[PDB]
Design a protein around this ligand. Sequence first.
Ligand code: FES
Ligand code: FES
Ligand code: FES
Ligand SMILES: [Fe+3]
Ligand SMILES: [Fe+3]
Ligand SMILES: [Fe+3]
Lengths: 167, 167, 167, 441, 441, 441
Amino acid sequence: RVSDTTVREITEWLYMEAELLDAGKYREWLALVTEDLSYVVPIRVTREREAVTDVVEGMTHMDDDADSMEMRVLRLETEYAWAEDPPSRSRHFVTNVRVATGDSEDEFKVTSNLLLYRTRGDVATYDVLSGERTDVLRRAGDSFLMAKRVVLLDQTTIMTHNLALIM
Amino acid sequence: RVSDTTVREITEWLYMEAELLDAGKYREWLALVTEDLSYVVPIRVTREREAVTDVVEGMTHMDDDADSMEMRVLRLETEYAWAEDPPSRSRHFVTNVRVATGDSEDEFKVTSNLLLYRTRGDVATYDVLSGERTDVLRRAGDSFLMAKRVVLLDQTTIMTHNLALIM
Amino acid sequence: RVSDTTVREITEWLYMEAELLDAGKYREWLALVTEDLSYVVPIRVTREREAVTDVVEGMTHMDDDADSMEMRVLRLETEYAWAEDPPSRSRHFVTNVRVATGDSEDEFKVTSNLLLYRTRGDVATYDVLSGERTDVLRRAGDSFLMAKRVVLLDQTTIMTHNLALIM
Amino acid sequence: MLSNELRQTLQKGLHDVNSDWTVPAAIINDPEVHDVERERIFGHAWVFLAHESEIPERGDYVVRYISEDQFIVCRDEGGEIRGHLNACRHRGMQVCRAEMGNTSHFRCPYHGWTYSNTGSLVGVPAGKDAYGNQLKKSDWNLRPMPNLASYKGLIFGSLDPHADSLEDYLGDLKFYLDIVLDRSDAGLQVVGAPQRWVIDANWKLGADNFVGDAYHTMMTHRSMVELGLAPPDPQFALYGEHIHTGHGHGLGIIGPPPGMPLPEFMGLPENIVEELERRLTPEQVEIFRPTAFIHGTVFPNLSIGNFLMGKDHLSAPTAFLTLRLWHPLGPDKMEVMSFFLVEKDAPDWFKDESYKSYLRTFGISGGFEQDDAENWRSITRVMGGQFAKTGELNYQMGRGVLEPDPNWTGPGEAYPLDYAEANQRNFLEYWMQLMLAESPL
Amino acid sequence: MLSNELRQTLQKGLHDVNSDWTVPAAIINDPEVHDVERERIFGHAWVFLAHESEIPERGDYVVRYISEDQFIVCRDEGGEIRGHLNACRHRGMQVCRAEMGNTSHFRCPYHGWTYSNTGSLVGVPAGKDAYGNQLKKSDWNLRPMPNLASYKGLIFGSLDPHADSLEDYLGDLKFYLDIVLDRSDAGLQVVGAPQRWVIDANWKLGADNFVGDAYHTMMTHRSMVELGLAPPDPQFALYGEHIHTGHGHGLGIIGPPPGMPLPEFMGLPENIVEELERRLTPEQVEIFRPTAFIHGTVFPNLSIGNFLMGKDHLSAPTAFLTLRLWHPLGPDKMEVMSFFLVEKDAPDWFKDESYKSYLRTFGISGGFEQDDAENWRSITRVMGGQFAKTGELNYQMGRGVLEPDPNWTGPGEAYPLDYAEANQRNFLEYWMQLMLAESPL
Amino acid sequence: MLSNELRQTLQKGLHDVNSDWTVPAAIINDPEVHDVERERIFGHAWVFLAHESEIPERGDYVVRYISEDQFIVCRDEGGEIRGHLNACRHRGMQVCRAEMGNTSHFRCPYHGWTYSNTGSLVGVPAGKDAYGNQLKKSDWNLRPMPNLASYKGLIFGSLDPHADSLEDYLGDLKFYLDIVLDRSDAGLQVVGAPQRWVIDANWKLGADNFVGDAYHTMMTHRSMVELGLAPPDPQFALYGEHIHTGHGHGLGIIGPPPGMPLPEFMGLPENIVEELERRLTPEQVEIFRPTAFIHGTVFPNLSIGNFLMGKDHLSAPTAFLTLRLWHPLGPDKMEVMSFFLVEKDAPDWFKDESYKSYLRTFGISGGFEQDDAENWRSITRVMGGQFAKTGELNYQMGRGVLEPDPNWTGPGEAYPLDYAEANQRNFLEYWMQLMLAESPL
Ligand code: FES
Ligand code: FES
Ligand code: FES
Ligand SMILES: [Fe+3]
Ligand SMILES: [Fe+3]
Ligand SMILES: [Fe+3]
């Protein structure tokens, strides 16, 4: 239970992370992740309230580890990643930040609400993704590394044309 | 004037409240409210800048007390609340949290910006409600209870098909 | 490096500022700005990832100083500011607040994410602006004044019909 | 002109409605249906705009609609009720961009042409310098609603200058409207303003529901049955009457069973009961005496609910009246405008109680209406499918069984129960006649 | 009826596709094209709905589409596969508002009409009190899909009661579907559910791509070529075969060059290889033996990718199968439904590896497909211009050069390389023939 | 083809515009109007695309529009100005997805076809392996703008290969364009890029306003009159001229009253004045000499504002030039593209001052233009009403009074004041003539 100076550091860490992403600083962002990274975006289906879960088992929108997340960044560093070249303009609005102690000392369970705004080109339209991110952050030196993230979107059918952006 | 540890607690309370709502934990949410609860969503109409107010007198979108809020939750606990079964996917983004002292000691005036995101079924559309919540929170044991909330939306014509969700 | 009590004060300052704007308290908001105010909203154009910048040089959506911002407010205090009479309903969602030390003592660099929600009249539609604000705040008495703001929107083609609102 | 497909569908529909007792599904959510309907229904029929109690003082106005057309409805400086197209005669700007207010004049922001709330163009900037005094102001007054009229406080308009009078249009329905509108000496008041919100459903589904449908209560409102707020008896609507009139209008009236005493006259306050016994005819009085629910639609899109209901699961019921517009926005979209009304002279305790009974059941957050909304949006979505559209809606309730009630003392075609679909059939028959009218009526 | 402009365009196109080898550009993003196509293609063709492994137990259902029409596809309480229009026979409400689940009955929320998963209407509230027992329930069962059939686990539906059988419609394509669908005794399974998301592009661009396009790899997937995930040889598709069939169907098959040994049968697990050698004909076995990529489209909008690929830039490749729907939402919009399939009896290590190889390359976040999506939305946007639409699309690859492969052992029209546009031309020729059909076929 | 309703409306309008001096209100916001207009106006007229100063170096390009059609406007490697449809000849992808930049080649991301900025197809991947060298590259260059031309730095395009030349189309308007465009040896420069934003209004409202409307200043810009930024004299526009030409084009020119000395030539810097006195004819010089405001529209949707204005309530005015496109997005939507221009050799102090005078008054955040936008969106909304659309727009300013100015020294039809609606009538007349042209002109 409790934190305080830690809440501040974790919160600032989230805002710095989001800033790197919104600046297209993917290589720098990749330095924030852990060697055992698990990064997942589940699929949801509409179900009656009675259902125990509406999260799909065995299939996912995205299920990355450190190696595949490196591939993702390496792709964006070529001259040919057409989905993001020209780059989207994006904004990661990170709100409702909750911090809890993790399963080990030096680990923290971090939950935030994300609204991701996205435009491309000169067409007068925009996309919004809304969802909850559940993270495990690990102390590393005088900062943190992300060991785990689950992005659960408030959508079943996703309302953007690809998931070319890291959330 | 002032607070500090109190700001943290109140902020954490608001994020916990939103979390319960977004998880459809209505029975748990009901335990956060006070016996003299007043929960209201006023109607607004477009008026010239000169008008003293654009808030409707005598009529409301919602005007609940503890008994009627209980009914609202009891309804959602039947097998027949069709508007929310299947449940909406919602997200309460709570930002711009302002905390002031109340009219009594042990009471606080808490004002937040709310953006409420909502999807239903598998249709590729979504609703957004935006507004300001002005609350009265009361100390109760080591936490707080909500005695009052006014949700003032930035809309006159409401842009969702019902107010089936608590804001 | 570092702040703390200062972070709180600056954050509360930003929420107080947003609140004034969303209440149409333009004259009071004008009191928050410095004599050497620079307020700018740059133009962006879609470019390949390789481009050093996508921000237009020499032309802007808005480039105000203290005198022109005064004019802006004086306009809204006439009985004839048709763009904002009747007033828009707006909400400044201010998130991801980052505070750093400025170029002088008593100055702070303040970066926040803005999502601006806007409706007008009784038509069932709404506008969203999304962007990053980078500010210089200066200590003045026991509070702050804004000396500089840059609002960089996540749009090239702007998706509202005028910039009659202060961001 | 109608496409051959739509024409044939409507012609077939006009035969089926009274033989098979079905109606083609293609009428619910279709762009061509919507476009033709805009002219053939909303350009001809009388449409509810406002209650007179919303604009009680000289200068008072509200802005209201017939489809996309926007009208200022006001009490002018001479005390007359006006309906003005909200479009400056010069370049068409809105001369009022508020939803309601009070003003003696409407001044156009574009060039400043100034209109009395009478509608008269009374001021033109540069009348001399720019127009050389050659502009005839009286030729450029705000355009009047072609037909405007009132029945017992209800302001209606029609876009058709050659429409039958409001009173002829309402016809036999007037007998029943009186029972809801004319109980008190001081009259009804709308309280505050209507709730207005958008439902992704076709407007006709709201109209269909209120014109005739008690049947839906048992399933749609099953949650409310379990909470003790809706009638628990599955046969509750047998103790009622199902009534329709010409021009697509219909209603149902439901009372309690023999072994259930409820206060007479919906338990209205004593002073109102005094007045209603003197204002209404003995025949109207006796029809109202044992009422618990009245639901109906004034064709096309004004519905009435006068219901006796608890404000929560712990409270004794009180009567409330609501009028609502199912405002057409597109084939698959509508804006509900839901008004709460109460007798001006009801005691304040009753006004508050009746307001809470309405608010927790109907309207945007009501425990009944929120499920009604979900049902209509669902039907609308799946009724946009091309295969779905080749089917029929089943209005066969009572086929081979319904006989008119020989003992009913009111006008109209009346059946001695309120589980029937005769009202919905009459509504759609009239809608289909209007859709096919190449020349009006 | 077709506009004269559209008719003439289609007629010209039907000549151009086999002479100039071009197709009019106006077919890509046009509101009339989309409206005509809805009836003429999607109201007649066989459309993929679900895989049988999605609904393995009695009572299991998914909700799927033919354009805007929504269908419950379920295994009923007798073990039969059904397809029910999801529109109650009474007033058209959805009887199932979930995307999938398990139930023995579908109960309409509006009035409580209750259907067996069989489709039979079995329960009507107030059957006596409201209907006098006159309502013949068997006349108001859920409306069946006019034509429903299965080929090797794939459930298709057609809106046309007079369609050719599924087996005739697939025709010679069946030989090749077997190679992908019928390798194992226990059969394929869809893992979890499809990824569904919206691309602002016309559906045809996805079909066009998978029916015959290996050419795009070198540029569209240049990033992946640089990372070592896509084939580095610019001539890679010369080691392959371009095949098409009647009814618009086409596929390509690509294997490794002579100086590159790869495990046979895409390196599938040993037990699966055992089974396929015994399940497929020797001719099918030998076509499959050296395969690295299979891409195709089943007209109209079901595509297949059976590809050997790394799950990241450091890994050896594994085989994965995906089926996808390009679901039409509008002239400029679609919903992709991407399914991952694997043989039920594959070892769990292989299922996980295959899943990852699919996931990082294809689907919503895949390093290949995300660029495909960007290409299709870009085309669609510019192809909405009136001038852009007077132009042609170039399908000339192979013009003056293509000769059928005399040595190919499979059915269909086959060419001995997979840089060709014959499949795309055959797809759009059938499309245009259906568009111009005043009476079916 | 036109509906009979639209045809009859236009024919009646063509008579009304010069007799009653009114125009049907149905032309502002209507889906059929927009769709016919797209072809009949934007498919035939000359439309402004870019200023040459935006693409000063070889390889420079911008992406611009004629309605939904997207064109690359560039200076190619030989220094020639080109307009290329931004749609690959293969499958129609955008070969440039940036809004502006510099490149020697456009390479399509989909299959890598590579075009010179000349437009020539210079490279095709697998030219040999896929196409067998049979693809004639010179048949598949980027499609040129059918008609491309420049007048004094302004690049226009027409979609009609048989259009009249740009010079004939501009006609007598050229005399006045010179006064704004040709003052300096080095020419004008667009500073930075246009402001681009979406207003929910029909494009014609902006064109209408700038072609001849000074009248609106007194009310629309009353706030600015009170702040001292707009002219305080209600008669200010009497000191000016209202002028129109063939092809719908028109302008107004306003100067100060006799008892108000203002610097000659809008107070332009000395070196620009020197150059203008030598670049323009004495007749053009003397018309420009006492100018304070020039406003006009190049039919269809290019407007010009050359205004003398304060950058705030405390500052002496400086002159600025703005050109703006009213880009049609839909019947009820447009994109404004607002450019600021200044003479390249103006001293820097003046460039900055002029920029600020423009920025605080016009453009997206300008204290004038923001109220203009509000007026246009308001008109548009209420003019979508079916009943509103049966009315007329009043263009009767001057009827029975206007006489051509016998003393005007420039070409065109000129009136000795700028309170008049002749220019607007001339704009709408030409618009109506084009809308009714079954064959061009
Ligand atoms: S549009 Fe109203 S005064 Fe001109
Ligand atoms: S709509 Fe299904 S029971 Fe009435
Ligand atoms: S679409 Fe451009 S190379 Fe194929
Ligand atoms: Fe109901
Ligand atoms: Fe691809
Ligand atoms: Fe103006």
